[PDB]
């Protein structure tokens, strides 16, 4: 359905009713002549600014647009003021004439005829007499037509009006007028046609058939003759245009007979597009039809083109796009342009000279004239109906494939596409990540397992490789655009806000010590100073106290002093020193040289800070050479060290922290630090992998990168399902090529054809998609072709502007790990349960691979494209038992459907996969990972991603957009292990090490780091369940695994000779042969049993959480053998009380013993604002008497308002792990009959007592002579040391704080 | 002018089982030219607004209603997952359909907050593209709101109607989610589509109902589906016989109503119904004298309108004046003036 | 289609029910939002919404919630008579 350079849309419509024509009576026209406005009555501005008064262009009306204007006036238009100025006056001094004779009250009734009112008018303006017209202003419309009713007077009536026996021959009337400032070229002007000139035509009335071929005779001899058929206005008529050309309108492709047709058929096919049953219009077909000098047999010409679209536009068609109602010249431009393409012209109706066919199918109408037959064509592929069109969109659109029976072979679709793509292309990256921080931190001090420095790892070999180098580099350009500096640093002093002392558990930090940024100050981005120090000055991070002064140094200071801190330095001594200074500035690669610096750095970076103070220091290269050294020379000069490290951008640097700068230190490298460094390494290796898919930046997309961009450009496409249609091949084999990501779709139009431009993202994903193809599918055509839309242009950005939510950060992650535990050689078989419509499941498994995938929905690719041996997909519901018919496999899956399927039965998990797991054991199955909710580490519910219900076992996703049910794990456990008590079970969760990561950037998705820590713990509580019948399971002795304990484990085995390993948050923690062993948690012995064909391991873990073993001989991969988890202690502190008699308000208070493991260090603090703070210990004292802690405490008036704690002590933070609150004070009375004591209950505390109903005191400020007994107390005993206390003689009094 | 009258019907409700073969069918002259011609003038004829946005509020109020009949607690929820699977068409001057701003504000009084909207359909821009008439790859949702036409590739061909109507109804019972709730819009509801209806779904869900807005003359209902379940046991009842009967009688009955209108573009000589008669005179002298032309020119033009109302004008030309008098002529009025054996003088 | 359109009765009884003193009793907040507070015999007693973390001597945070809407807990009371401000 398209005609040269036009598209047509299958459906055809045209309105159903002609409306009759009627004269003008005489009264209504004075009327329209008196109306006090004419402008929208006579003539219209289609062109007026309202900012001046001004317009350009004038469309006319029946009574003026008869007016031929005259040279002078053309040669010299006025300007719009002018215009209705002169308007104005002409048309009532016209009335005046037309009623000086002819009084309206004789003759009001009477009809104008429209030709002569038209030519009298027209001279009158054109300051020509008129007189010989009024004779004849009316006629009898029941006796005569308004052209018969002049041809009663055959003669020259006036030079430019002749009438003979049977026709009449005037100028065309002007239908625009331009006025001053007129523009052509200014292509957003309205475009007119050239009828604006005052002879671009001539038309000849005629009153009968003969009549008409004696003009044509004439006329035979120039140019060519054009007339309407349908509804000729005011009567039959030919018009016979100028033979000349007009400007502007194209590339001089005109001339004035084309424009004429041209503009027509444009008519004819807006009328055609918005025509209604309910409407009756004066004409159903607007076009003109050529009746002399004309070839039908060639189409080289415009106005044959035009006459071959008016042949065909007249049985009803519409044009995909709609078409101005005031067309400018731009838009003209664009219709002859399309029309002059190359293409096929129509011939579904052949050209007749005089007379026109009509399909009788069509909606089309003929009049009762004979100028109209109908005809049939062989193959017309139109049908009736109404088309309604849709505004542009301001995105480009994405599709989703659906795919027609038809496929077709690799080589074709790869030849279709290679000359339709844009191979190599420019695209953007954007940016990656997208803010946020990964940041960990690891206390050394605190691990007593002594570990020689000479064992530690060190850098990898290729660490300074120009390839990870260089990828290091382009990763550093991909985060978004901030001040790196600036939150590096505020994750640090978040951490040094809660440094606690261990020995007292009061801050380390105090409100006014002595800073300074030893760390080179160095006019970051738009300041002169590091950002943080306004932060830390204005007290903007929370719990850091304010520092009296700050001093900077460095080589880049401004504010401050330049020095080099590799020397000794004269300078003072300061509470925090804050060392962030750079080491690679003068050390590319030279290690030593690097390794020297830095130990010169810290040294001098202790020796600046006071005794009991705090030091930090930025490291750029962990080495085990730099460790040695650091033990060999500052072990002594602090009490603790732990490692603060956050992740902006992938690097190996690290901060070290050193609290309490003092002379006698014991600092030792301890298993800690073993810890830290390969979780370091190991991330640094999982963002590399994830990098090498991304191209470098100047390099044009050449289809080598794995996350590249492919794209396929077309021009006027018309898709169909018809065989070897280029169109479709090519969409098929892009889309084959992008299928897991999305695919983008634009429509341009250019000033000719419209451009169609298809695109996606390529990944190894998609690769791996298509290499299990075997015939490249066709799609459904409906929803492009449909579309007729116009888009923004593409714009081929690698990475989207916004970071994705957490939940698809878990779905890559176990992505991840299903596609690393289907690459076992030793499957031959896979069924998968509840697999989405769309099979993605594909794009994860080698090719190789047998799979066999279900869901109730009916798939949504098709299945001839692919291996039937390989592939296979069952419709149905695997929560029946009638599910399982014929079913066969060696291994199955369910990731994220348990839970809902579980739901949909309305059951608990435990009845659920009770009933599930036999079937699969009956299906010939052996092992499978299965994806149970259950909160493993422990119940805590995600503040808006998981709600956690506790009265009934389910989750609430999203707020509750989705509910499911859970069990607990312990239960879970024991249930399966009823089931098969044989075979072994393991857990996978999201690790640390972020290994996953190439499933979130290397398909093209970008990040914010901060969320990595929420999305693990979202893991944690929807773990994965691997479960191996092939395999005998794990077995330990002390069941509930109690932290820090001897415990013996076996792995039942055949072979002495294999190898074992343990991990833990995803790094090996232990491994080696039971000749020797090497641990990072405990002391480890490990022993093969010959006689019972075991490995012993006996093991004292120095850590929680889930701990993994595998075992592993020389020439196989290693082989899981189960997994355990280890329990922290328990958390129940208890304390015994003194009777009441023993309650002392006295001045010495009382004393109370505590029972609790020595695991957790005490101290007695306050809740005071979402934090404890520790009390003064004149108050309370958690003692360390030899055997056992105590608590002794003293009792004040203010007890019972207040509540305060037995708080966990760690360095990291006070009351962490377990806060005890101390209830009995909070409820203990005081005996009236004995002195009592009194004081604020908070640092700013304001407090007033009342005795009795009595007021008493402000105990802020008490009366300067106190109330008659009472005094000020000796021990403080207040809540801060600061306040005092006052003793009360007796009475009982009231608290208002 | 505005508003609605709309009508609920519900079917599960009623127990009395109905054989779908008995069903009442379209008219047989529905699609006859007249008629529909009638039907598009009818369209015309009402004040201009957004037609969708006042049929989508009336459904959306119904659905804020429903409860589930075993444990009377509504059906949708906050944060519920809703799939505007209808047509976003770029309505009007918005880029979606208006209804959503309401739906993601809340102004719809007791509907729940659904946690996010995916739209769907040929002229989407803030969704996909996607025909309904296949499997899709689009997941699953709570809330089904399927605002489809059948028409825009089905003139009057109503077998291929049925089928895309079919293929559409299918598909979107597969994107509910279990006890979710979908809603369809059907424009002609055959007793061939209902045949297959019963045929295939009847265990797809727990309730059905039927909500019918009345906007403009037209055949076209509203399916909900509650409690998408996989052993549901919906039949064809008495109920749904009600509601189609009740149906083509407002339908037959406006159609009448509209015959007396004239068409648009028809100058009105004197053959329409309701047309409008006048007549002009000059200066005229009213008197009762016999034969006064002014005098009985106006007791002409009042026989052939009182019972509508008479108006009046009275304009001053530069010479005389021109005074007009006029009204709407019914068929009451032809009524009473058949009545009349001689035209009183006024 | 909807709940109670068609009647709708009052639990006219439970609206005069008298509390015996004597015995351990039971409180809750009365609405979705409804924040609620209590008087011991004329005694403030507790802000129901936010009880005082040292709760007064005797009551509990009842097992069954039996409050209006199920999030909301029931604290039991061991005696007394109490008012309800909301």
Same mark, same amino acid.
């Given at each position: 359905?398209?005609?040269?350079?036009?598209?047509?849309?299958?459906?055809?419509?045209?309105?159903?009713?002609?409306?009759?024509?009627?004269?003008?009576?005489?009264?209504?026209?004075?009327?329209?002549?008196?109306?006090?406005?004419?402008?929208?009555?006579?003539?219209?501005?289609?062109?007026?600014?309202?900012?001046?008064?001004?317009?350009?262009?004038?469309?006319?009306?029946?009574?003026?647009?008869?007016?031929?204007?005259?040279?002078?006036?053309?040669?010299?238009?006025?300007?719009?003021?002018?215009?209705?100025?002169?308007?104005?006056?002409?048309?009532?001094?016209?009335?005046?004439?037309?009623?000086?004779?002819?009084?309206?009250?004789?003759?009001?009734?009477?009809?104008?005829? +429209?030709?002569? &009112?038209?030519?009298?008018? %027209? *001279?009158? @303006?054109?300051?020509? #007499?008129?007189? =010989?017209?009024?004779?004849? /202003?009316?006629?009898?419309?029941?006796?005569?037509?308004?052209?018969?009713?002049?041809?009663?007077?055959?003669?020259?009536?006036?030079?430019?009006?002749?009438?003979?026996?049977?026709?009449?021959?005037?100028?065309?009337?002007?239908?625009?007028?331009?006025?001053?400032?007129?523009?052509?070229?200014?292509?957003?002007?309205?475009?007119?046609?050239?009828?604006?000139?005052?002879?671009?035509?001539?038309?000849?009335?005629?009153?009968?058939?003969?009549?008409?071929?004696?003009?044509?005779?004439?006329?035979?001899?120039?140019?060519?003759?054009?007339?309407?058929?349908?509804?000729?206005?005011?009567? +039959?008529?030919? &018009?016979?245009?100028?033979? %000349? *050309?007009? @400007?502007?309108?194209? #590339?001089?492709? =005109?001339?004035?007979?084309? /424009?004429?047709?041209?503009?027509?058929?444009?008519?004819?096919?807006?009328?055609?597009?918005?025509?209604?049953?309910?409407?009756?219009?004066?004409?159903?077909?607007?076009?003109?039809?050529?009746?002399?000098?004309?070839?039908?047999?060639?189409?080289?010409?415009?106005?044959?083109?035009?006459?071959?679209?008016?042949?065909?536009?007249?049985?009803?068609?519409?044009?995909?796009?709609?078409?101005?109602?005031?067309?400018?010249?731009?838009?003209?431009?664009?219709?002859?342009?399309?029309?002059?393409?190359?293409?096929?012209?129509?011939?579904?109706?052949?050209?007749?000279?005089?007379?026109?066919?009509?399909?009788?199918?069509?909606?089309?109408?003929?009049?009762?004239?004979?100028?109209?037959?109908?005809?049939?064509?062989?193959?017309?592929?139109?049908?009736?109906?109404?088309?309604?069109?849709?505004?542009?969109?301001?995105?480009?659109?994405?599709?989703?494939?659906?795919?027609?029976?038809?496929?077709?072979?690799?080589?074709?679709?790869?030849?279709?596409?290679?000359?339709?793509?844009?191979?190599?292309?420019?695209?953007?990256?954007?940016?990656?990540?997208?803010?946020?921080?990964?940041?960990?931190?690891?206390?050394?001090?605190?691990?007593?397992?002594?570990?020689?420095?000479?064992?530690?790892?060190?850098?990898?070999?290729?660490?300074?490789?120009?390839?990870?180098?260089?990828?290091?580099?382009?990763?550093?350009?991909?985060?978004?655009?901030?001040?790196?500096?600036?939150?590096?640093?505020?994750?640090?002093?978040?951490?040094?806000?809660?440094?606690?002392?261990?020995?007292?558990?009061?801050?380390?930090?105090?409100?006014?010590?002595?800073?300074?940024?030893?760390?080179?100050?160095?006019?970051?981005?738009?300041?002169?100073?590091?950002?943080?120090?306004?932060?830390?000055?204005?007290?903007?991070?929370?719990?850091?106290?304010?520092?009296?002064?700050?001093?900077?140094?460095?080589?880049?200071?401004?504010?401050?002093?330049?020095?080099?801190?590799?020397?000794?330095?004269?300078?003072?001594?300061?509470?925090?020193?804050?060392?962030?200074?750079?080491?690679?500035?003068?050390?590319?690669?030279?290690?030593?040289?690097?390794?020297?610096?830095?130990?010169?750095?810290?040294?001098?970076?202790?020796?600046?800070?006071?005794?009991?103070?705090?030091?930090?220091?930025?490291?750029?290269?962990?080495?085990?050479?730099?460790?040695?050294?650091?033990?060999?020379?500052?072990?002594?000069?602090?009490?603790?060290?732990?490692?603060?490290?956050?992740?902006?951008?992938?690097?190996?640097?690290?901060?070290?922290?050193?609290?309490?700068?003092?002379?006698?230190?014991?600092?030792?490298?301890?298993?800690?630090?073993?810890?830290?460094?390969?979780?370091?390494?190991?991330?640094?290796?999982?963002?590399?992998?994830?990098?090498?898919?991304?191209?470098?930046?100047?390099?044009?997309?050449?289809?080598?990168?794995?996350?590249?961009?492919?794209?396929?450009?077309?021009?006027?496409?018309?898709?169909?399902?018809?065989?070897?249609?280029?169109?479709?091949?090519?969409?098929?084999?892009?889309?084959?090529?992008?299928?897991?990501?999305?695919?983008?779709?634009?429509?341009?139009?250019?000033?000719?054809?419209?451009?169609?431009?298809?695109?996606?993202?390529?990944?190894?994903?998609?690769?791996?998609?298509?290499?299990?193809?075997?015939?490249?599918?066709?799609?459904?055509?409906?929803?492009?072709?449909?579309?007729?839309?116009?888009?923004?242009?593409?714009?081929?950005?690698?990475?989207?502007?916004?970071?994705?939510?957490?939940?698809?950060?878990?779905?890559?992650?176990?992505?991840?790990?299903?596609?690393?535990?289907?690459?076992?050689?030793?499957?031959?078989?896979?069924?998968?349960?509840?697999?989405?419509?769309?099979?993605?499941?594909?794009?994860?498994?080698?090719?190789?691979?047998?799979?066999?995938?279900?869901?109730?929905?009916?798939?949504?690719?098709?299945?001839?494209?692919?291996?039937?041996?390989?592939?296979?997909?069952?419709?149905?519901?695997?929560?029946?038992?009638?599910?399982?018919?014929?079913?066969?496999?060696?291994?199955?899956?369910?990731?994220?459907?348990?839970?809902?399927?579980?739901?949909?039965?309305?059951?608990?998990?435990?009845?659920?996969?009770?009933?599930?797991?036999?079937?699969?054991?009956?299906?010939?199955?052996?092992?499978?990972?299965?994806?149970?909710?259950?909160?493993?580490?422990?119940?805590?519910?995600?503040?808006?991603?998981?709600?956690?219900?506790?009265?009934?076992?389910?989750?609430?996703?999203?707020?509750?957009?989705?509910?499911?049910?859970?069990?607990?794990?312990?239960?879970?456990?024991?249930?399966?292990?009823?089931?098969?008590?044989?075979?072994?079970?393991?857990?996978?969760?999201?690790?640390?090490?972020?290994?996953?990561?190439?499933?979130?950037?290397?398909?093209?998705?970008?990040?914010?780091?901060?969320?990595?820590?929420?999305?693990?713990?979202?893991?944690?509580?929807?773990?994965?369940?691997?479960?191996?019948?092939?395999?005998?399971?794990?077995?330990?002795?002390?069941?509930?695994?109690?932290?820090?304990?001897?415990?013996?484990?076996?792995?039942?085995?055949?072979?002495?000779?294999?190898?074992?390993?343990?991990?833990?948050?995803?790094?090996?923690?232990?491994?080696?042969?039971?000749?020797?062993?090497?641990?990072?948690?405990?002391?480890?012995?490990?022993?093969?049993?010959?006689?019972?064909?075991?490995?012993?391991?006996?093991?004292?873990?120095?850590?929680?959480?889930?701990?993994?073993?595998?075992?592993?001989?020389?020439?196989?991969?290693?082989?899981?053998?189960?997994?355990?988890?280890?329990?922290?202690?328990?958390?129940?502190?208890?304390?015994?009380?003194?009777?009441?008699?023993?309650?002392?308000?006295?001045?010495?208070?009382?004393?109370?013993?505590?029972?609790?493991?020595?695991?957790?260090?005490?101290?007695?603090?306050?809740?005071?604002?979402?934090?404890?703070?520790?009390?003064?210990?004149?108050?309370?004292?958690?003692?360390?008497?030899?055997?056992?802690?105590?608590?002794?405490?003293?009792?004040?008036?203010?007890?019972?308002?207040?509540?305060?704690?037995?708080?966990?002590?760690?360095?990291?933070?006070?009351?962490?792990?377990?806060?005890?609150?101390?209830?009995?004070?909070?409820?203990?009375?005081?005996?009236?009959?004995?002195?009592?004591?009194?004081?604020?209950?908070?640092?700013?505390?304001?407090?007033?007592?009342?005795?009795?109903?009595?007021?008493?005191?402000?105990?802020?400020?008490?009366?300067?002579?106190?109330?008659?007994?009472?005094?000020?107390?000796?021990?403080?005993?207040?809540?801060?040391?600061?306040?005092?206390?006052?003793?009360?003689?007796?009475?009982?009094?009231?608290?208002?704080?």
């Amino acid at each position: 359905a398209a005609v040269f350079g036009i598209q047509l849309v299958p459906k055809l419509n045209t309105s159903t009713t002609r409306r009759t024509f009627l004269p003008l009576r005489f009264d209504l026209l004075l009327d329209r002549l008196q109306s006090t406005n004419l402008h929208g009555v006579l003539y219209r501005a289609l062109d007026f600014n309202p900012v001046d008064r001004s317009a350009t262009v004038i469309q006319t009306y029946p009574p003026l647009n008869a007016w031929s204007p005259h040279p002078a006036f053309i040669e010299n238009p006025l300007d719009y003021r002018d215009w209705t100025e002169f308007i104005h006056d002409r048309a009532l001094a016209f009335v005046g004439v037309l009623t000086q004779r002819y009084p309206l009250t004789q003759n009001a009734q009477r009809y104008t005829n +429209p030709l002569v &009112l038209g030519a009298a008018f %027209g *001279d009158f @303006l054109n300051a020509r #007499s008129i007189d =010989i017209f009024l004779d004849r /202003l009316f006629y009898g419309p029941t006796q005569e037509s308004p052209i018969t009713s002049i041809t009663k007077f055959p003669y020259q009536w006036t030079i430019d009006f002749n009438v003979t026996a049977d026709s009449v021959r005037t100028p065309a009337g002007c239908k625009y007028i331009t006025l001053y400032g007129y523009d052509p070229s200014r292509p957003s002007t309205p475009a007119t046609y050239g009828k604006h000139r005052p002879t671009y035509a001539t038309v000849f009335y005629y009153s009968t058939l003969p009549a008409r071929s004696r003009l044509l005779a004439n006329l035979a001899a120039g140019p060519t003759v054009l007339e309407h058929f349908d509804s000729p206005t005011y009567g +039959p008529h030919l &018009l016979l245009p100028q033979t %000349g *050309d007009v @400007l502007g309108y194209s #590339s001089s492709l =005109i001339s004035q007979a084309a /424009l004429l047709m041209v503009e027509s058929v444009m008519d004819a096919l807006r009328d055609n597009a918005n025509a209604s049953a309910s409407t009756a219009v004066t004409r159903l077909d607007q076009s003109y039809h050529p009746v002399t000098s004309f070839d039908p047999s060639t189409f080289n010409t415009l106005l044959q083109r035009a006459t071959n679209l008016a042949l065909l536009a007249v049985q009803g068609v519409q044009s995909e796009s709609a078409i101005p109602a005031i067309p400018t010249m731009s838009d003209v431009r664009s219709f002859v342009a399309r029309l002059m393409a190359e293409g096929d012209p129509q011939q579904w109706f052949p050209y007749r000279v005089d007379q026109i066919l009509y399909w009788p199918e069509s909606p089309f109408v003929p009049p009762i004239g004979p100028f109209y037959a109908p005809f049939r064509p062989v193959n017309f592929p139109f049908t009736t109906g109404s088309y309604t069109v849709v505004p542009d969109a301001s995105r480009p659109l994405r599709l989703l494939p659906q795919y027609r029976n038809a496929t077709i072979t690799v080589q074709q679709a790869d030849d279709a596409y290679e000359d339709t793509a844009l191979s190599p292309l420019i695209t953007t990256h954007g940016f990656c990540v997208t803010g946020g921080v990964s940041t960990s931190i690891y206390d050394i001090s605190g691990d007593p397992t002594a570990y020689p420095p000479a064992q530690l790892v060190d850098t990898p070999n290729d660490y300074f490789d120009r390839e990870r180098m260089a990828r290091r580099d382009l990763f550093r350009r991909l985060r978004a655009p901030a001040d790196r500096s600036a939150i590096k640093d505020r994750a640090v002093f978040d951490f040094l806000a809660s440094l606690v002392n261990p020995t007292t558990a009061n801050p380390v930090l105090d409100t006014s010590f002595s800073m300074a940024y030893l760390g080179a100050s160095s006019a970051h981005a738009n300041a002169d100073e590091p950002v943080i120090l306004a932060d830390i000055r204005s007290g903007s991070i929370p719990g850091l106290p304010i520092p009296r002064r700050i001093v900077q140094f460095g080589y880049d200071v401004v504010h401050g002093s330049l020095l080099d801190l590799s020397r000794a330095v004269p300078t003072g001594t300061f509470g925090l020193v804050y060392a962030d200074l750079d080491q690679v500035e003068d050390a590319g690669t030279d290690m030593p040289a690097a390794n020297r610096a830095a130990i010169a750095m810290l040294g001098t970076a202790l020796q600046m800070t006071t005794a009991g103070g705090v030091s930090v220091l930025k490291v750029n290269f962990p080495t085990r050479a730099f460790w040695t050294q650091v033990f060999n020379l500052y072990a002594t000069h602090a009490t603790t060290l732990h490692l603060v490290k956050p992740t902006i951008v992938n690097s190996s640097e690290v901060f070290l922290v050193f609290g309490g700068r003092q002379s006698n230190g014991a600092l030792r490298s301890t298993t800690a630090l073993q810890r830290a460094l390969l979780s370091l390494y190991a991330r640094n290796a999982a963002i590399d992998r994830a990098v090498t898919h991304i191209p470098f930046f100047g390099v044009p997309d050449d289809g080598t990168s794995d996350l590249g961009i492919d794209a396929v450009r077309l021009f006027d496409p018309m898709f169909s399902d018809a065989v070897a249609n280029l169109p479709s091949n090519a969409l098929a084999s892009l889309v084959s090529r992008v299928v897991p990501s999305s695919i983008m779709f634009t429509r341009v139009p250019s000033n000719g054809p419209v451009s169609t431009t298809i695109y996606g993202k390529r990944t190894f994903l998609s690769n791996r998609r298509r290499a299990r193809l075997r015939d490249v599918p066709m799609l459904i055509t409906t929803t492009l072709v449909h579309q007729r839309r116009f888009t923004t242009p593409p714009t081929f950005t690698l990475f989207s502007s916004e970071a994705v939510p957490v939940t698809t950060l878990v779905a890559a992650g176990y992505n991840s790990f299903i596609s690393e535990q289907t690459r076992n050689p030793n499957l031959a078989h896979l069924l998968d349960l509840g697999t989405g419509p769309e099979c993605r499941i594909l794009s994860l498994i080698p090719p190789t691979l047998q799979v066999t995938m279900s869901d109730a929905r009916p798939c949504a690719e098709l299945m001839a494209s692919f291996d039937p041996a390989l592939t296979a997909y069952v419709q149905g519901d695997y929560s029946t038992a009638a599910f399982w018919n014929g079913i066969r496999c060696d291994s199955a899956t369910a990731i994220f459907t348990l839970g809902a399927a579980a739901a949909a039965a309305g059951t608990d998990l435990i009845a659920f996969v009770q009933q599930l797991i036999p079937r699969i054991v009956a299906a010939g199955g052996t092992r499978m990972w299965l994806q149970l909710n259950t909160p493993l580490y422990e119940v805590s519910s995600l503040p808006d991603l998981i709600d956690i219900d506790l009265r009934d076992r389910v989750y609430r996703f999203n707020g509750g957009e989705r509910v499911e049910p859970y069990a607990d794990p312990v239960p879970l456990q024991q249930a399966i292990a009823a089931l098969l008590p044989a075979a072994a079970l393991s857990w996978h969760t999201l690790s640390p090490t972020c290994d996953w990561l190439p499933y979130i950037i290397g398909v093209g998705s970008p990040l914010n780091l901060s969320d990595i820590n929420t999305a693990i713990s979202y893991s944690r509580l929807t773990p994965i369940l691997h479960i191996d019948t092939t395999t005998p399971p794990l077995r330990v002795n002390p069941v509930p695994t109690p932290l820090n304990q001897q415990c013996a484990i076996r792995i039942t085995s055949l072979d002495p000779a294999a190898v074992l390993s343990v991990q833990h948050n995803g790094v090996e923690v232990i491994g080696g042969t039971p000749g020797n062993v090497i641990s990072v948690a405990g002391a480890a012995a490990l022993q093969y049993i010959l006689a019972n064909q075991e490995f012993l391991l006996q093991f004292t873990p120095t850590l929680p959480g889930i701990f993994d073993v595998f075992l592993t001989t020389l020439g196989q991969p290693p082989v899981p053998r189960g997994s355990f988890t280890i329990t922290p202690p328990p958390t129940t502190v208890v304390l015994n009380m003194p009777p009441p008699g023993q309650l002392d308000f006295t001045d010495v208070g009382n004393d109370a013993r505590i029972t609790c493991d020595p695991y957790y260090q005490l101290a007695v603090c306050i809740f005071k604002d979402g934090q404890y703070v520790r009390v003064n210990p004149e108050k309370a004292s958690v003692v360390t008497n030899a055997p056992n802690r105590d608590l002794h405490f003293v009792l004040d008036l203010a007890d019972n308002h207040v509540l305060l704690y037995l708080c966990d002590v760690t360095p990291s933070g006070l009351g962490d792990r377990i806060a005890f609150p101390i209830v009995d004070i909070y409820r203990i009375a005081f005996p009236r009959n004995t002195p009592v004591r009194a004081s604020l209950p908070y640092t700013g505390g304001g407090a007033h007592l009342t005795s009795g109903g009595n007021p008493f005191m402000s105990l802020t400020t008490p009366p300067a002579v106190l109330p008659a007994g009472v005094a000020l107390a000796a021990l403080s005993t207040s809540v801060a040391t600061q306040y005092p206390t006052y003793t009360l003689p007796a009475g009982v009094y009231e608290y208002v704080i």
